[PDB]
């Protein structure tokens, strides 16, 4: 039916509506250190999110999105393994219902607590749509999360969550401040990939952060508190909403760092 991450619409069953599941670049992977190759033609990365514009906040069934206005280069992405201008369209994330699961990337095999996604768009496209029909039409910059201490800047998302329990539902967010939710490194691993929920689109270039956030326990538990139904529907709580780790096939990783 349609497709989710339950026992009978899992990402195993993905490939009968989306064949490309099977594709060649598809996310997420394992990031294996030993064999990533250091990159130092790679260039620092550069997130100007000054001038940021959140908009609102909409449970779609399969995660929360905060998104953003895009119609300008207000919050961009720059530089790192990209050519051009990347526009930040929304972040979400993904988590598991216990602390040891919930990223969609991996590190040696280890898994964390959840996962950010900020995902742009490359401007040389004109919009989101015709982004997603080229090969380095978007970039996404990824983020683990472990349990420690709470994040400051992640509690004004924490706190809206009541008011959009269900699918369908939305909440003003204005004047959320991305900046808030970045580790104080910027080091990362970059390959090329896909979008790691249906359309499954391998249109990405992957950047993923080194340094994990800090959250706390009770930061995690009210994202576990969310719905995949919609209201009046028998609740199904909103955890584990990750795809397992896919064959790299021929791509190598490239470190920013060694
Ligand atoms: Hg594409
Ligand atoms: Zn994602």
Redesign the pocket.
């Known amino acids: 039916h349609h497709w989710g991450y339950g026992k009978h619409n899992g990402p195993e069953h993905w490939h009968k509506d989306f064949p490309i599941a099977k594709g060649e670049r598809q996310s997420p992977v394992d990031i294996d250190t030993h064999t990533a190759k250091y990159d130092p033609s790679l260039k620092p990365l550069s997130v100007s999110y000054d001038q940021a514009t959140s908009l609102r906040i909409l449970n779609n069934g399969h995660a929360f999105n905060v998104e953003f206005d895009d119609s300008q280069d207000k919050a961009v992405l720059k530089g790192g393994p990209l050519d051009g201008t990347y526009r930040l369209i929304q972040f979400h994330f993904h988590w598991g219902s216990l602390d040891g699961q919930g990223s969609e990337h991996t590190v040696d095999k280890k898994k964390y607590a959840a996962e950010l996604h900020l995902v742009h768009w490359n401007t040389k496209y004109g919009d989101f749509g015709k982004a997603?029909?080229?090969?380095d039409?978007l970039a996404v910059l990824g983020i683990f999360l472990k349990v420690g201490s709470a994040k400051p800047g992640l509690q004004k998302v924490v706190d809206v969550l009541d008011s959009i329990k269900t699918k369908g539902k939305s909440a003003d967010f204005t004047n959320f401040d991305p900046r808030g939710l970045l580790p104080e490194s910027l080091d990362y691993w970059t390959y090329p990939g896909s979008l790691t929920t249906p359309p499954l689109?391998?249109?990405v270039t992957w950047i993923v952060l080194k340094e994990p956030i800090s959250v706390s326990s009770e930061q995690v538990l009210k994202f576990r508190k969310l719905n995949f139904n919609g209201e009046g529907e028998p609740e199904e709580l909103m955890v584990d909403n990750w795809r397992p780790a896919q064959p790299l096939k021929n791509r190598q990783i490239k470190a920013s760092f060694k």
């Open positions: 997603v029909q080229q090969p039409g689109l391998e249109c």
